[PDB]
Amino acid sequence: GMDTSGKQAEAMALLAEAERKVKNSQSFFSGLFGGSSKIEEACEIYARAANMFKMAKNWSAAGNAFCQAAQLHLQLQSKHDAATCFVDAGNAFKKADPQEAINCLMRAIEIYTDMGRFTIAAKHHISIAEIYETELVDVEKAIAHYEQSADYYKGEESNSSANKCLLKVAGYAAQLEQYQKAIDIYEQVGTSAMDSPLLKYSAKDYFFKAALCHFCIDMLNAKLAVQKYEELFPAFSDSRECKLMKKLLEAHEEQNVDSYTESVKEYDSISRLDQWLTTMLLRIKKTIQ
Amino acid sequence: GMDTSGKQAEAMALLAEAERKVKNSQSFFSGLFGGSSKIEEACEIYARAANMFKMAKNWSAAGNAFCQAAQLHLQLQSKHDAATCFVDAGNAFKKADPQEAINCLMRAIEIYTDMGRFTIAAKHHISIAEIYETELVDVEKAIAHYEQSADYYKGEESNSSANKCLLKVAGYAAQLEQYQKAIDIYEQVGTSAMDSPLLKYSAKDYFFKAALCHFCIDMLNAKLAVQKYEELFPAFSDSRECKLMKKLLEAHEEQNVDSYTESVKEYDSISRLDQWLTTMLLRIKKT
Amino acid sequence: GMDTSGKQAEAMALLAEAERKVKNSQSFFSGLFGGSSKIEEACEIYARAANMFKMAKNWSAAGNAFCQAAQLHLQLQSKHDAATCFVDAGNAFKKADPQEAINCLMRAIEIYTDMGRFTIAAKHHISIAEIYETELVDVEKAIAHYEQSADYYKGEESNSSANKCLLKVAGYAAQLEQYQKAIDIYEQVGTSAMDSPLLKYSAKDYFFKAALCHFCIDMLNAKLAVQKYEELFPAFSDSRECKLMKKLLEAHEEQNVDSYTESVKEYDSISRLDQWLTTMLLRIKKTIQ
Amino acid sequence: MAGRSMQAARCPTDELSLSNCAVVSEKDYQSGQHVIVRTSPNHKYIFTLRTHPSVVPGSVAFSLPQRKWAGLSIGQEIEVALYSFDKAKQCIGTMTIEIDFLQKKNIDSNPYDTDKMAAEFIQQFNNQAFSVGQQLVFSFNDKLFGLLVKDIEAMDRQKIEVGLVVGNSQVAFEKAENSSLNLIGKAKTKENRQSIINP
């Protein structure tokens, strides 16, 4: 396309113009000492060239120009504008090179939490974690990033946001990490919604997830915990999950895999699985001996 | 009301005295060279007079005043103010004649991009995309705008907004019978929504539509594709969508036009269908 | 209330200071020069007092203070702040005495659409209509206001908000106004909703209402209207409402009160009727002869 | 001849309503003329004219049955042009008319002599235009009946789709399927009878 070719051609021209502008700016500072207008205008050229370059479908050099412009701008004691460019540069790198995007975003987060905005900093933390897990295969850093994010939301009483992330942290921890952290987070979040305005009849599932986690540990802890919820929360007594878990509890007691297999089969037929309960149930069945 | 149209004529006189304000640029700013603020207030009288037309429901005149005010104001300074005027002109031009609104919005897109503000630019890209659909008939240009808007959103991790934009693109592409693009988008969204708890219930619809698109090109590969979906997602079978498809494909093995007709009617007996689904089934099942 | 008593005490003190500030104003228009800044400070205290009245529960005084501050502010070649205070002055007047809230809003409407913005102006239009219908016993002006809001919305392509505005005005008009308009808007919205996948499942209700509006005038063209509707919308034949119409018109041709009354009762047995449709059915019944 | 725009009006008198004739003003037409009424490119309907002093010039009056058959509304603009029959081809030898009580309140089981029906029909509607599927109201011994034209045949045995009823036309009535009507006398078809016996 003509648009692309022309945009790249004028991209290089502007970049060359900016490079000669900065070198001449160094010469002019001693030569004439015009102040700082020379550098800031050169930054404007960098911003324009970078922003038109990204429109030209090319990304890597676009973010590189943003970082250079932000670096020079921060050299003149201006922080917020450079940090915004850092966020813009990191986002552009998201489809080019994750490592540079992560580094710049962390730079933006530290300066933002240096300015004093935590919702923005924690929002960036989610973005860092989301990219970290979606494409790169690793969990531990994601847990740390989310936990830090959950702390920042609670720092300003953003209960809903903190509730969601802590639930997300607990879920993955249960999947791979040990179960004690899952027990505390799942139990605390579930019991903290008994008087929800609209989520009143939703807290039930939270206790169900906890019950499975205790059952994964040992039988005695499974039953003891199951009762504790029965007295604590009366409505859980008449939940369909309560009957299912009781049926699974007594079935596993007598070592009859057929009862367990049919019990899970009927549950799946009545309502669908979630791809997370099935894995836990299969692992439970693996230790029936 | 009627007298506000009377002051609309006086507002045209306000533009007329704004014509004298540019007549100052013809001769009088030689001695008022420092009256750059005089040009600013000249633009201000333009703006308030520009919309005293926008009182009188004179869409064309209001748009003309906005565009003229923007052109005068964009003296290589206060660019964002000119951009606001340009988008306002496009918003005014939306009614009556939206043709020139496209050019003004495109100019605003260039300015916003130059400034680097993605979200506003991409949102305006959606606006020009939908006006094409609802007023004009070209769809390929709308597809290009949606693709560009989606790319801008995906850069800033606004996955959900880009997700819906791609979903609309896939549907239009499917209506334009380019199935490879449609299946790729539907598969990508389907496997991505299942990644997080908040959207795991929605995928069943995504997989069903994708299976139909696969089911249109190569029937033989459809059985392998549905098997791959079933094994990838163990919770895909009992859903009425999967059972219905399994019946349709197996029924087609034998030439019994009846078999499929009651099935689609029976499925329709529980809920109504959409133009997109009904049209695709009518076309595909013809052979 | 001691909190309100001291609140009113300081409120009076600010009024005395404000009375001294208008004295400052007149002494600075005729006695001194450059009072624009001094009266600007007077406006700040007027806003300072006016709002504090709004916290003192004295709504009427707060509205008066806002109006006085705005009208004084209009003289300084400034208009946006005039609009904000006009809207705030109205917001105070919505309760207690709302008659002057209409006048001030219309002025605020005049200024806003003397500035360049529609969606705010049209939003205030519908607000004026809503307050007019809820507390003033008159409907014709509501029709005009809804029509004006409809024109602004649909023009700006905000079709979604326009559709409901056109729907409500047409429905209300059917109650006390000739049904030709009711048919036109109902048909127009139904046809527009047909292509869109959003309202296609619910357009049958609009088609149902249009038939009822047409039936109330005469029978023969109503048969023409319904047959035309199902011809354009084949899936309207299976709708339970279509069967209800066919039974109703067939019974009415027979001039049998019992059959018509039991049929409508049978429909009422399932689901529920509404305040509007019941009146429509009674009105058509009364002229059965 | 070329055609002129006219406004549809209501029939002025009960007597003219039963004539099945479009009522016009003497200043515009003469009684007995036939016109073709146009409501759209695909809807052209033929009527016979009968003048009445009360019709305003520039308007054509129609009875309710005509408006229902013709899809005409009072006050609607129509195009009316004179129509001339080719009597060599458009005279009716036989028409089949479906008949039923107009008002259900006045239904009775008394016999009605079709031979007397046909003679009265000819006396009332001679030299008037009729079309297949046309609807009209017909009065007989002070009883109102709804009529529907089912078939038309030419005068002397060529079949035709449309014709003109004349004095010597012979009409045959056949009861509609699922009709308990008991018909006696001539002026009918009385088709064969498919016995239950097999060959």
PDB file of C-alpha atoms in Angstrom, chain A residues 6-93:
ATOM      1  CA  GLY A   6       5.078   6.764   2.483  1.00  0.00           C
ATOM      2  CA  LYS A   7       4.560   6.596   6.244  1.00  0.00           C
ATOM      3  CA  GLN A   8       7.746   4.568   6.737  1.00  0.00           C
ATOM      4  CA  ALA A   9       9.707   6.850   4.399  1.00  0.00           C
ATOM      5  CA  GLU A  10       8.621   9.951   6.314  1.00  0.00           C
ATOM      6  CA  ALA A  11       9.115   8.034   9.569  1.00  0.00           C
ATOM      7  CA  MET A  12      12.834   7.666   8.854  1.00  0.00           C
ATOM      8  CA  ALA A  13      13.030  11.296   7.722  1.00  0.00           C
ATOM      9  CA  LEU A  14      11.461  12.509  10.972  1.00  0.00           C
ATOM     10  CA  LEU A  15      13.683  10.207  13.037  1.00  0.00           C
ATOM     11  CA  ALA A  16      16.733  11.533  11.191  1.00  0.00           C
ATOM     12  CA  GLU A  17      15.442  15.084  11.667  1.00  0.00           C
ATOM     13  CA  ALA A  18      15.002  14.447  15.393  1.00  0.00           C
ATOM     14  CA  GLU A  19      18.496  12.950  15.699  1.00  0.00           C
ATOM     15  CA  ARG A  20      20.059  15.999  14.052  1.00  0.00           C
ATOM     16  CA  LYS A  21      17.756  18.222  16.115  1.00  0.00           C
ATOM     17  CA  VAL A  22      19.062  16.813  19.404  1.00  0.00           C
ATOM     18  CA  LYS A  23      22.728  16.978  18.376  1.00  0.00           C
ATOM     19  CA  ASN A  24      22.233  20.575  17.242  1.00  0.00           C
ATOM     20  CA  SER A  25      20.348  21.235  20.485  1.00  0.00           C
ATOM     21  CA  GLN A  26      23.454  20.198  22.420  1.00  0.00           C
ATOM     22  CA  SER A  27      25.484  22.551  20.220  1.00  0.00           C
ATOM     23  CA  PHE A  28      22.989  25.399  20.626  1.00  0.00           C
ATOM     24  CA  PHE A  29      22.782  25.106  24.421  1.00  0.00           C
ATOM     25  CA  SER A  30      26.406  26.228  24.703  1.00  0.00           C
ATOM     26  CA  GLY A  31      26.345  28.225  21.469  1.00  0.00           C
ATOM     27  CA  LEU A  32      23.329  30.422  22.215  1.00  0.00           C
ATOM     28  CA  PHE A  33      21.828  29.067  25.459  1.00  0.00           C
ATOM     29  CA  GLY A  34      18.198  29.295  24.401  1.00  0.00           C
ATOM     30  CA  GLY A  35      17.005  27.460  27.508  1.00  0.00           C
ATOM     31  CA  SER A  36      15.158  24.177  27.008  1.00  0.00           C
ATOM     32  CA  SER A  37      12.768  24.863  24.104  1.00  0.00           C
ATOM     33  CA  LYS A  38      15.095  22.957  21.766  1.00  0.00           C
ATOM     34  CA  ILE A  39      14.775  19.661  23.647  1.00  0.00           C
ATOM     35  CA  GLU A  40      11.014  19.816  24.229  1.00  0.00           C
ATOM     36  CA  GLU A  41      10.279  20.522  20.561  1.00  0.00           C
ATOM     37  CA  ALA A  42      12.555  17.623  19.605  1.00  0.00           C
ATOM     38  CA  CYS A  43      10.451  15.474  21.936  1.00  0.00           C
ATOM     39  CA  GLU A  44       7.349  16.653  20.072  1.00  0.00           C
ATOM     40  CA  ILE A  45       8.986  15.510  16.827  1.00  0.00           C
ATOM     41  CA  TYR A  46       9.738  12.165  18.475  1.00  0.00           C
ATOM     42  CA  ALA A  47       6.142  11.876  19.682  1.00  0.00           C
ATOM     43  CA  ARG A  48       4.706  12.731  16.260  1.00  0.00           C
ATOM     44  CA  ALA A  49       7.046  10.366  14.409  1.00  0.00           C
ATOM     45  CA  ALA A  50       6.377   7.544  16.874  1.00  0.00           C
ATOM     46  CA  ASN A  51       2.612   8.071  16.776  1.00  0.00           C
ATOM     47  CA  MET A  52       2.403   8.199  12.982  1.00  0.00           C
ATOM     48  CA  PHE A  53       4.757   5.209  12.801  1.00  0.00           C
ATOM     49  CA  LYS A  54       2.408   3.061  14.888  1.00  0.00           C
ATOM     50  CA  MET A  55      -0.439   4.025  12.546  1.00  0.00           C
ATOM     51  CA  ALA A  56       1.759   2.526   9.804  1.00  0.00           C
ATOM     52  CA  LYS A  57       1.221  -0.963  11.356  1.00  0.00           C
ATOM     53  CA  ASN A  58       4.875  -1.148  12.545  1.00  0.00           C
ATOM     54  CA  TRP A  59       5.199  -1.441  16.321  1.00  0.00           C
ATOM     55  CA  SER A  60       8.688  -2.261  17.617  1.00  0.00           C
ATOM     56  CA  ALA A  61      10.372   0.992  16.588  1.00  0.00           C
ATOM     57  CA  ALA A  62       7.270   2.943  17.643  1.00  0.00           C
ATOM     58  CA  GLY A  63       7.667   1.975  21.293  1.00  0.00           C
ATOM     59  CA  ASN A  64      11.421   2.493  21.018  1.00  0.00           C
ATOM     60  CA  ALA A  65      10.762   6.092  19.980  1.00  0.00           C
ATOM     61  CA  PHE A  66       8.325   6.477  22.882  1.00  0.00           C
ATOM     62  CA  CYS A  67      10.919   5.244  25.377  1.00  0.00           C
ATOM     63  CA  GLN A  68      13.582   7.588  23.992  1.00  0.00           C
ATOM     64  CA  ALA A  69      11.182  10.540  24.085  1.00  0.00           C
ATOM     65  CA  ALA A  70      10.115   9.689  27.639  1.00  0.00           C
ATOM     66  CA  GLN A  71      13.729   9.235  28.760  1.00  0.00           C
ATOM     67  CA  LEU A  72      14.721  12.643  27.392  1.00  0.00           C
ATOM     68  CA  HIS A  73      11.548  14.246  28.760  1.00  0.00           C
ATOM     69  CA  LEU A  74      12.202  12.850  32.242  1.00  0.00           C
ATOM     70  CA  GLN A  75      15.705  14.325  31.939  1.00  0.00           C
ATOM     71  CA  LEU A  76      14.018  17.749  32.226  1.00  0.00           C
ATOM     72  CA  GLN A  77      12.387  16.977  35.618  1.00  0.00           C
ATOM     73  CA  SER A  78       8.941  16.184  34.147  1.00  0.00           C
ATOM     74  CA  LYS A  79       7.660  12.861  35.497  1.00  0.00           C
ATOM     75  CA  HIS A  80       3.953  12.320  34.801  1.00  0.00           C
ATOM     76  CA  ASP A  81       4.193  12.976  31.057  1.00  0.00           C
ATOM     77  CA  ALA A  82       7.126  10.569  30.733  1.00  0.00           C
ATOM     78  CA  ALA A  83       5.295   7.962  32.819  1.00  0.00           C
ATOM     79  CA  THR A  84       2.237   8.203  30.565  1.00  0.00           C
ATOM     80  CA  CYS A  85       4.550   7.709  27.587  1.00  0.00           C
ATOM     81  CA  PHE A  86       6.018   4.716  29.431  1.00  0.00           C
ATOM     82  CA  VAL A  87       2.529   3.214  29.696  1.00  0.00           C
ATOM     83  CA  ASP A  88       1.923   3.959  26.017  1.00  0.00           C
ATOM     84  CA  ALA A  89       5.314   2.507  25.070  1.00  0.00           C
ATOM     85  CA  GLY A  90       4.746  -0.635  27.126  1.00  0.00           C
ATOM     86  CA  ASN A  91       1.333  -1.219  25.561  1.00  0.00           C
ATOM     87  CA  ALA A  92       2.822  -0.947  22.064  1.00  0.00           C
ATOM     88  CA  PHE A  93       5.519  -3.487  22.969  1.00  0.00           C
TER      89      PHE A  93
END
